[PDB]
């Protein structure tokens, strides 16, 4: 039962398969499919409650945006500035700039930049024709500066459903909505977020590979104080098994989302996301919610995500106590060499 | 300059050397001598202040007890119970019984027992003649139950000097005085204490080998939750260099103390103590003081003993947070494998 996203769905009106295997990149690990269910299906509510991924096919979450495309957006999205990452590779590794101080030997593989939507659309058209290899990925939180047409679409989202989801799971507040527009083949390397996420696909298809919190040992996140904190150190395209032995034991949950699908990415779950090759641009809007608070009474043993919370904290504390994050490793090693390993 | 305790001191009245090399056990590491100074010497006050060991030859700290011997003690020490450890080896590894729950696969190498002084003196005489190999070490905090003669000796200690030492170093309170009587050849394996110690030799000679806090990496203490917490895991008689590689880089400060000497053992300093072979029984009384409080403002970088304080705390916290000390190691390893090592 390790097929992956399964047999490519067939579009209504005999419009052919939505995409085919040859558009998916190749990796060294097996994966099983994430369930695709109706939001009225109890099994889906069971998955959301037990914090497991599930693709919801009929939430109508971002019904109003399904009509969005570059042309329409350039038109009414507003005059604000949009963050746009550029890279010479398909991999868009995220790096926290605030943390770039702690690590100087770190050379960003992708540089961010501000611009007006029309400029992004332009730099995009520019590359497209000139046969360029440069890559772009616009990632911008939706704010006040957006057009009224866009604000109307926004109000049109299925708030009744999501708000009830937030209520049912005791989640905290919606912290933001990230608008993501990217070129086909673009890849966001495996990482995990400290929040609950309802990932709404709008245009194009995205293959989503998730790993549960308990595979922390196989994914090897960077040190908490490094800029790529929360991202996996393993290059999925050329895994170094000498440095990352347990990546040979990794198993993912996979799926391909399209216009109308909503992928629940539970807090702490690793996820690798890619826009299909030759699938054209992709558009997604995510909804990030602070997770519920730590229970009054802790039950033992601890869940995997709780142990991850503890490790991050130990790393943060040692960083402040020692007065320098670069000392964390030597201390940690001194503490275990010949004592716990 | 790695001789050790140096040339054996000559006793007053041409009474020959106090002891000779052949009474010292053999070890794989080099050592340099701990300074022997007059307590009126400024260099000694400098060492105590900068927290470095120093043997003080004329404090008159326990002047009144210099006359103590088994006979006299059996006579006036009182009726109380005395803790007495027994072992089939010369090594008396200390183990915290409260912690024996956390580790069941731990089999004590020495068993404690209560008895009246006269009984200890008896079990001692018993072995001595019957040509036994069993070993004994009486270690007992001095309390109310002691005889008036003993209480008079006690009041006779040089409180004026030590109390001023406590005052000068901002130390906390005297927590106890451990009376230690042991058979020649007896060994107390390397460990460190969380308190300041003025170690007063009374009868017999003891070779003291100290290692500074910064050799934590070469001495490999047991995990904080193990019964032998604070003791070194390395068998000094047959060091396992495969498990404890850095023990090949250890360097000690050594000395031999006799009746009248007071060895300042700074808090956190490792110390291995042995009664000379064929030196007859030994008697020592130590004075344990809580160390000064953490400074208002921490200066960076941290001193070695502060990093040791931090590691112990991390281990203690992880133990409670995970609800089980046995999980500390796996968590620690998961946290560093492929991330910090």
């Amino acid at each position: 039962v390790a097929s992956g996203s399964g047999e490519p769905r067939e579009e209504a009106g005999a419009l052919g398969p939505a995409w085919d295997e040859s558009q998916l990149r190749s990796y060294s690990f097996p994966t099983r499919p994430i369930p695709r269910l109706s939001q009225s299906d109890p099994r889906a509510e069971e998955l959301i409650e037990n914090e497991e991924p599930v693709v919801l096919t009929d939430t109508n979450l971002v019904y109003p945006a399904l009509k969005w495309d570059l042309e329409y957006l350039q038109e009414n999205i507003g005059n604000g500035d949009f963050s746009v990452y550029s890279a010479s590779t398909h991999k868009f590794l995220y790096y926290d700039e605030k943390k770039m101080a702690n690590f100087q030997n770190f050379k960003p593989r992708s540089n961010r930049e501000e611009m007006k939507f029309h400029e992004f659309v332009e730099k995009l058209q520019d590359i497209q024709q000139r046969g360029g290899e440069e890559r772009l990925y616009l990632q911008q939180t939706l704010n006040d500066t957006v057009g009224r047409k866009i604000v109307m679409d926004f109000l049109g989202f299925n708030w009744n459903w999501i708000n009830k989801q937030q209520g049912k799971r005791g989640w905290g507040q919606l912290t933001s909505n990230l608008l993501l527009i990217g070129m086909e083949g673009n890849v966001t390397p495996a990482h995990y977020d400290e929040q609950q996420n309802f990932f709404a696909q709008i245009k194009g298809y995205k293959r989503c590979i998730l790993f549960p919190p308990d595979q922390f040992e196989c994914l090897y996140p960077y040190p908490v104080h490094h800029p790529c904190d929360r991202q996996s150190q393993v290059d999925f395209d050329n895994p170094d098994y000498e440095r990352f032995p347990n990546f040979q034991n990794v198993v993912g949950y996979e799926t391909v989302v399209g216009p109308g699908d909503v992928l629940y990415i539970p807090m702490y779950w690793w996820h690798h996301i890619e826009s299909l090759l030759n699938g054209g641009i992709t558009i997604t809007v995510n909804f990030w919610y602070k997770g519920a608070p730590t229970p009054k009474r802790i039950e033992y043993p601890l869940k995997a995500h709780q142990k991850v919370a503890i490790m991050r904290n130990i790393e943060k504390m040692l960083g402040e106590a020692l007065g320098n994050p670069q000392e964390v490793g030597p201390l940690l090693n001194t503490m275990i060499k010949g004592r716990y390993n | 300059v790695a001789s050790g305790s140096g040339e054996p001191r000559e006793e007053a009245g041409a009474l020959g050397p106090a002891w000779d090399e052949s009474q010292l056990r053999s070890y794989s590491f080099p050592t340099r001598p701990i300074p022997r100074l007059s307590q009126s010497d400024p260099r000694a006050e400098e060492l105590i202040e900068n927290e470095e060991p120093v043997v003080l030859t004329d404090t008159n700290l326990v002047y009144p007890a210099l006359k103590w011997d088994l006979e006299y003690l059996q006579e006036n020490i009182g009726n109380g119970d005395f803790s007495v450890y027994s072992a089939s080896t010369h090594k008396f590894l200390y183990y915290d019984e409260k912690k024996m729950a956390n580790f069941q696969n731990f089999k004590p190498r020495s068993n404690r027992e209560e008895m009246k002084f006269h009984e200890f003196v008896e079990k001692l005489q018993d072995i001595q003649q019957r040509g036994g190999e069993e070993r004994l070490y009486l270690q007992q905090t001095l309390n109310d139950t002691v005889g008036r003669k003993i209480v008079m000796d006690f009041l006779g200690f040089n409180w004026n000097w030590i109390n001023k030492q406590q005052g000068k170093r901002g130390w906390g309170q005297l927590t106890s005085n451990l009376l230690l009587i042991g058979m020649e050849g007896n060994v107390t394996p390397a460990h460190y204490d969380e308190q300041q110690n003025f170690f007063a030799q009374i009868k017999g000679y003891k070779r003291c080998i100290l290692f500074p806090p910064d050799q934590f990496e070469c001495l490999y203490p047991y995990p904080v939750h193990h019964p032998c917490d604070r003791q070194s895991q390395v068998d000094f008689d047959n060091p396992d260099y495969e498990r404890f590689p850095n023990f090949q880089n250890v360097v000690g400060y050594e000395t031999v103390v006799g009746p009248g000497d007071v060895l300042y053992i700074p808090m956190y300093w490792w110390h291995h103590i042995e009664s000379l072979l064929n030196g007859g029984i030994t008697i020592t009384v130590n004075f344990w003081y809580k160390g000064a409080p953490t400074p208002k403002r921490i200066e960076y970088p941290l001193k070695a003993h502060q990093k040791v304080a931090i590691m112990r705390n991390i281990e203690k916290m992880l133990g409670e947070a995970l609800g089980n000390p046995q999980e500390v190691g796996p968590l620690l390893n998961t946290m560093i494998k492929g991330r910090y090592n």
């Binding site: 926290d96 912290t175 400290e194 997770g291 730590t294 709780q306 904290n313 | 916290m317 947070a321």
Partner: peptide, 10 residues
């Protein structure tokens, strides 16, 4: 305490 989480995202 050590179980407390923060809230970071890409």
């Amino acid at each position: 305490r050590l179980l407390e989480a923060s809230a970071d995202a890409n």
